[PDB]
Write a protein that binds this ligand. Structure first.
Ligand code: CL
Length: 117
């Protein structure tokens, strides 16, 4: 990752709250970061919950492209713009399913740009 140690202190209160709400284990978060995505609410509602905590998504899992881009380092923004060209709009049966399809889409197309923690 390009995510610096500090960012783990930042999202700590929100990460812990998002894991309680959805029954998420740390092993599930590690599976996402090794490219092993499964359509399970405890992991995909966690992803939605974290994104929602940092205003990357609204109430129907529509992504805010400018906020999502400004979180990435400058170096990846060209490639992230192209990935976002492909993977947006979001799509799915509910918010958790939308973030699932987004994650699978972003990972398939460019592992570097996907922000789960
Ligand atoms: Cl799902």
């Amino acid at each position: 990752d390009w995510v610096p140690p500090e960012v783990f202190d930042l999202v700590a209160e929100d990460k812990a709250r998002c894991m309680s709400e959805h029954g998420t284990t740390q092993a599930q978060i590690d599976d996402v970061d090794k490219g092993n995505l499964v359509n399970e609410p405890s992991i995909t509602c966690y992803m939605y919950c974290l994104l929602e905590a940092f205003s990357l998504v609204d109430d129907e899992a529509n992504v805010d492209e400018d906020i999502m881009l400004g979180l990435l380092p400058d170096q990846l923004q060209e490639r992230a713009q192209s990935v976002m060209g492909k993977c947006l709009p979001t799509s799915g049966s509910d918010n958790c399913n939308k973030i699932y399809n987004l994650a699978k889409c972003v990972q398939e197309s460019a592992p570097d740009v996907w922000f789960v923690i």
